Amino acid sequence: DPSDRLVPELDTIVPLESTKAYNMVDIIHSVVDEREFFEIMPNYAKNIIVGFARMNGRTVGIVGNQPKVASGCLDINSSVKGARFVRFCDAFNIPLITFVDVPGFLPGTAQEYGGIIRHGAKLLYAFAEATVPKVTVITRKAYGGAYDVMSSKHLCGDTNYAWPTAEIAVMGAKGAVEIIFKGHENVEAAQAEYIEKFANPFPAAVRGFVDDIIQPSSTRARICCDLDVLASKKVQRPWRKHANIPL
Amino acid sequence: YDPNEKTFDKILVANRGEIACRVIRTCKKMGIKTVAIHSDVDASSVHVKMADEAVCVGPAPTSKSYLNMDAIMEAIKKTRAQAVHPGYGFLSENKEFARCLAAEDVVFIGPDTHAIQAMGDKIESKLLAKKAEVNTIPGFDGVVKDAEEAVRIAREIGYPVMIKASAGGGGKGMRIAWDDEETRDGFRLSSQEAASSFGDDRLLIEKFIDNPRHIEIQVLGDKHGNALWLNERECSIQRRNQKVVEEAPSIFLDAETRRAMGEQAVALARAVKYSSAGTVEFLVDSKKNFYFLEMNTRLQVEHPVTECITGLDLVQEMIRVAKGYPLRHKQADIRINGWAVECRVYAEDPYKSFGLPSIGRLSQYQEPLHLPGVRVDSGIQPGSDISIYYDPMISKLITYGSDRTEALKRMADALDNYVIRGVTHNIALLREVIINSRFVKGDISTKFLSDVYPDGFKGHMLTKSEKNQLLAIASSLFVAFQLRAQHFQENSRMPVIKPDIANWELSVKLHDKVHTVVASNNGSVFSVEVDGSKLNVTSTWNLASPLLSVSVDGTQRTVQCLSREAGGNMSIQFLGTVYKVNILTRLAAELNKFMLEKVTEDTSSVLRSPMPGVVVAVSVKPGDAVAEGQEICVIEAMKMQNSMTAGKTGTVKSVHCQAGDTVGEGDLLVELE
Amino acid sequence: ATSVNERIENKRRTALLGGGQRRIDAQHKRGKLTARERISLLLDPGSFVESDMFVEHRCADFGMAADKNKFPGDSVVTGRGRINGRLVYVFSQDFTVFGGSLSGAHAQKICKIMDQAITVGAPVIGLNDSGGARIQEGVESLAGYADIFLRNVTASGVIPQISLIMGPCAGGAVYSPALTDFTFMVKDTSYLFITGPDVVKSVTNEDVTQEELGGAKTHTTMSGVAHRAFENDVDALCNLRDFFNYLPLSSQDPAPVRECH
Numbered sequence A: 001d002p003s004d005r006l007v008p009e010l011d012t013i014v015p016l017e018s019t020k021a022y023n024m025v026d027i028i029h030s031v032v033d034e035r036e037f038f039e040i041m042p043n044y045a046k047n048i049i050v051g052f053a054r055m056n057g058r059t060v061g062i063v064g065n066q067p068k069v070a071s072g073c074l075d076i077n078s079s080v081k082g083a084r085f086v087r088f089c090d091a092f093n094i095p096l097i098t099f100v101d102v103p104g105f106l107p108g109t110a111q112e113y114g115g116i117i118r119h120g121a122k123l124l125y126a127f128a129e130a131t132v133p134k135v136t137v138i139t140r141k142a143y144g145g146a147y148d149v150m151s152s153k154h155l156c157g158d159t160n161y162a163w164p165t166a167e168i169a170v171m172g173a174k175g176a177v178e179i180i181f182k183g184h185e186n187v188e189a190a191q192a193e194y195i196e197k198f199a200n201p202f203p204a205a206v207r208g209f210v211d212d213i214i215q216p217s218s219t220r221a222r223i224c225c226d227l228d229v230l231a232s233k234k235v236q237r238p239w240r241k242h243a244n245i246p247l
Numbered sequence B: 001y002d003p004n005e006k007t008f009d010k011i012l013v014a015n016r017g018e019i020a021c022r023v024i025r026t027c028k029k030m031g032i033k034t035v036a037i038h039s040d041v042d043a044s045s046v047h048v049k050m051a052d053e054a055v056c057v058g059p060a061p062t063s064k065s066y067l068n069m070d071a072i073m074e075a076i077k078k079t080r081a082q083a084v085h086p087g088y089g090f091l092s093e094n095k096e097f098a099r100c101l102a103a104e105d106v107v108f109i110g111p112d113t114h115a116i117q118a119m120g121d122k123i124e125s126k127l128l129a130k131k132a133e134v135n136t137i138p139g140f141d142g143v144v145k146d147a148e149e150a151v152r153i154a155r156e157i158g159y160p161v162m163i164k165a166s167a168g169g170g171g172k173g174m175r176i177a178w179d180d181e182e183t184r185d186g187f188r189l190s191s192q193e194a195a196s197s198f199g200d201d202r203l204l205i206e207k208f209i210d211n212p213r214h215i216e217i218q219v220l221g222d223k224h225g226n227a228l229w230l231n232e233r234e235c236s237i238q239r240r241n242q243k244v245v246e247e248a249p250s251i252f253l254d255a256e257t258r259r260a261m262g263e264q265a266v267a268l269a270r271a272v273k274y275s276s277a278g279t280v281e282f283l284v285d286s287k288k289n290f291y292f293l294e295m296n297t298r299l300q301v302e303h304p305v306t307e308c309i310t311g312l313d314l315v316q317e318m319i320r321v322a323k324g325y326p327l328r329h330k331q332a333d334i335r336i337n338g339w340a341v342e343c344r345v346y347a348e349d350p351y352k353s354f355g356l357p358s359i360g361r362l363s364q365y366q367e368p369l370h371l372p373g374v375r376v377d378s379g380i381q382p383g384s385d386i387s388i389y390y391d392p393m394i395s396k397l398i399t400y401g402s403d404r405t406e407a408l409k410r411m412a413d414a415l416d417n418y419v420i421r422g423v424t425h426n427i428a429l430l431r432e433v434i435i436n437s438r439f440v441k442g443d444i445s446t447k448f449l450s451d452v453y454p455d456g457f458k459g460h461m462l463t464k465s466e467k468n469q470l471l472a473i474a475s476s477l478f479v480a481f482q483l484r485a486q487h488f489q490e491n492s493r494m495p496v497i498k499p500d501i502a503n504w505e506l507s508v509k510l511h512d513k514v515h516t517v518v519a520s521n522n523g524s525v526f527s528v529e530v531d532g533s534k535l536n537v538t539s540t541w542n543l544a545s546p547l548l549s550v551s552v553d554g555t556q557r558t559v560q561c562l563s564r565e566a567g568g569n570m571s572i573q574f575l576g577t578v579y580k581v582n583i584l585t586r587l588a589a590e591l592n593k594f595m596l597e598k599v600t601e602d603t604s605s606v607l608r609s610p611m612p613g614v615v616v617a618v619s620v621k622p623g624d625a626v627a628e629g630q631e632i633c634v635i636e637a638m639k640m641q642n643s644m645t646a647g648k649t650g651t652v653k654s655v656h657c658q659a660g661d662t663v664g665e666g667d668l669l670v671e672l673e
Numbered sequence C: 001a002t003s004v005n006e007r008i009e010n011k012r013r014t015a016l017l018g019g020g021q022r023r024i025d026a027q028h029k030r031g032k033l034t035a036r037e038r039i040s041l042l043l044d045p046g047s048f049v050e051s052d053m054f055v056e057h058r059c060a061d062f063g064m065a066a067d068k069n070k071f072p073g074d075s076v077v078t079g080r081g082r083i084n085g086r087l088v089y090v091f092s093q094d095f096t097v098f099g100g101s102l103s104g105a106h107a108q109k110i111c112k113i114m115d116q117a118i119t120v121g122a123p124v125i126g127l128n129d130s131g132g133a134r135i136q137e138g139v140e141s142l143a144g145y146a147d148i149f150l151r152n153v154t155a156s157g158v159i160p161q162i163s164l165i166m167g168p169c170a171g172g173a174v175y176s177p178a179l180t181d182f183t184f185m186v187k188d189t190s191y192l193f194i195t196g197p198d199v200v201k202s203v204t205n206e207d208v209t210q211e212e213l214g215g216a217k218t219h220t221t222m223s224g225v226a227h228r229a230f231e232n233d234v235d236a237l238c239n240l241r242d243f244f245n246y247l248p249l250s251s252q253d254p255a256p257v258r259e260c261h
């Protein structure tokens, strides 16, 4: 399996309008070697995908958001399952690839009484405490604290990419425009300017938050390049007996 | 050709698919600006991207997307294009479109509306054919009120043929004509049936077309009175009155019959003052007596095969004669160059109902453009989506050679080397039809697939030698994967001791039998013993390539591996057909005997909502049919709409869902049978 | 004309007065007290050394670069002090100016104080009441959060961290006390939730209040997010002080031993 083979079927995998879903497993199958993917607990917490695959012969752990189930929002079970997978993968020297498409967390009183703060902190800790090389691809959207949770740049990230369909923001456009310009009523002016200025990766690309905006059909090759350079990665951290994970 | 000649500046193509791509390619060759139109769903199509300018027209449903007269006229006015090519289908034969477009001083690449209207109605077209001194069905067209009249017509116009009854057919007096007894029998039966329903006791005697063959003559004619015939085509292999394979030259008719058909078609085209291109369709019986069937005044789907025999380009010649330039080639210039065969590959299952359409998305798509004497006419690319609103056509393969056998061999090679993953296609049916016994000799009729397959398509029945070859290939592939699973990198801390296996003993479950295999490796050559039969398999054993070329003891085979599991299951596309096989070792073969058979229960006919939400709209109606993959209803939740697809086709017992209703998790929506 | 010393004095007492006396009066009528008062009530008298007092946010977009919304310090007070003689680092979020929402400067000051604490080997106390993140800043604010998170995960098991929330924390801010070793609340004037009751009503349509969905009772009786609840601010600070007396300063140091009778 050549490392520089192209994936033209990924150019239009993400639908143009944001209310329609797509299968994230198709992207993973198209990217990994020979389209072979060992999936872990596939029938539990289907909101997220974790599994083992190979890139250029090297074993890689895969974490991805599933927009088909619950819109891809983070949860209790999703957080715990992803956290345990990431912890094993980082403990046994296995690189990580994550595919982010998430609007936030599931609302409701059941999640709030169940302690979703603790489990969200579990997933955030797992991503931030990892030392193996990790690569993130933003396909469509990453809103709010979910963007920081799901392997952001500022959590000691290594390589971060965005497809031309990616948009990164603190929240939805409508809510932002109705909590920024509230004193004076606006008709189609503020909404249009905010949409044409912030519904795109550029506010994150101008600040160096993403390395580059790449074409989808060239994703795999680029990943295969980054790992080839990142295998020599070593970091140092302050001495510590063991840490206090929010279990 | 010389592009320096004064031609049009901009051409707008009013179609979609592969015909749009062909027209765009020809226009680009000619050095002309091209404008395309597309639906909203077709924003990323190939013809949209190749054309210089693309203008959206509207929604996805073609009933008011590609037939919007006003939108197309507005696009013409906006783009300032002075000519339009309608291709075939849609608005190519539309009087209203032509009359609306003639008002703005924009030329139409196609025949004048007089030809369209004179071919629209059957009675006046038949009268014109009578005027055009072209032979038709010699069938009687009068009245037969008694049996003696039937025998009189029988002895007057000849009686080898099936009977007709003017108003009424298919059992209404349909008798095989060899003697007067069936005259009387058909008379009484048809008279009784007419007195019941039809009312006309008259009878007719239309000459047979038993064992019919469909012959097409391609005619090209400018507006100065010059017309040319471009040889013939045979399109006799059909399912649901749709052709699947065509061949331009025909072994049925000799030179004199070909000349007679050409002269008659040219005379008919001249009679109507034809322009651009058209086709004349005859039916021929077993005695080489052609009978007129119709005249289609439009470019045909199976046109390019004739191109391969004559070297012409129909699109450029017709766009040239659209401006008024007389055609160049004379009648003596046209000739026959070799043989050509065309196969249409669709997106449909060839096993169930003989071509049920299917929808999906292309996981990966490759075509054999490097093979000799092969051209591909397609309008799809990898990642393309097969929609329910359009024709499920995928591509057409055209293969030319010096003679029929070379063309058929090259077509089989091309079919075996053609990758379509993501949807179901009909490659197996075409691949099996090409190597049919009576197709090769030339005994093709209109009822080919009807009587060759009384019980429907069942795949390719592989003989004992081919069965042994398939078993050997599968065993060698299993061992190749097992050997590749041993190659690690150097650790230098805990070295890997490579296991040594002299030979691999395998139990291979195929169809309903189990075979015993002994496989040995000597580098890149596998020695396989299948029930005492020795075979040698050699290949490069590139495990990542979609194609795999192996050489089983001399014979070269091309195979594809579609699926593979750790439990021993494989799916092998071999000779065009997909075979499911189970592979195990000895030890697992005896240890699997003690394993209790877990009974599996599946329904696949009850629809359950996985997440709570609100049903925006129901896209189905009770008492209909749904394809495997077609979405039934859409439910929105958290502002995202989720499409609930299907998994089978069945009868809807009841519908428990309505539009605008809020449903929870696990709620019952649709019950099938 | 005017000298720079008078300008320094003007900046100084603007920073001391916070966002104004009317907003301080509103804060006191709400039932709670200010950030400076919290710091003075938690630390020993005269041991607080404020760090990096003069900071103004850098955001010229959306017309917020005018002089009407320039606030030195930018909604957080950071520094180092001593409890019973032992050194400690403290940050207290100010709800008066811009609602205590995170900005670039807010996060920068907190990150600097955390870096100093990790270098020296001293614990951190955080006093939280923040409305979330700025929408005017936009993408710049989220990054700030991530930085804080990293520091938290970096210091876990190295120095003890204490979180005490005295107001309505919402959004991603709620994830900073979660990584902290211990989290204490104050009754009737403190909330914690990722999503507010209005989005909950819009999406899953249950009628809830802020107390029922994020109150101290909820997080100390059924969710297990907080470790203790205190009646008001003063006794919460007293109990924070003696709990601090229990703990050591860093994992290098052994567990403290006190003179006993």
Ligand SMILES: *C(=O)CCCC[C@@H]1SC[C@@H]2NC(=O)N[C@@H]21
Pocket: A073, A103, A104, A105, A106, A107, B638, B639, C194, C195, C199, C202, C203
């Ligand atoms: C409707 O009001 C717009 C979307 C509602 C909030 C959505 S829902 C799931 C995500 N999690 C979150 O906190 N906001 C997002």
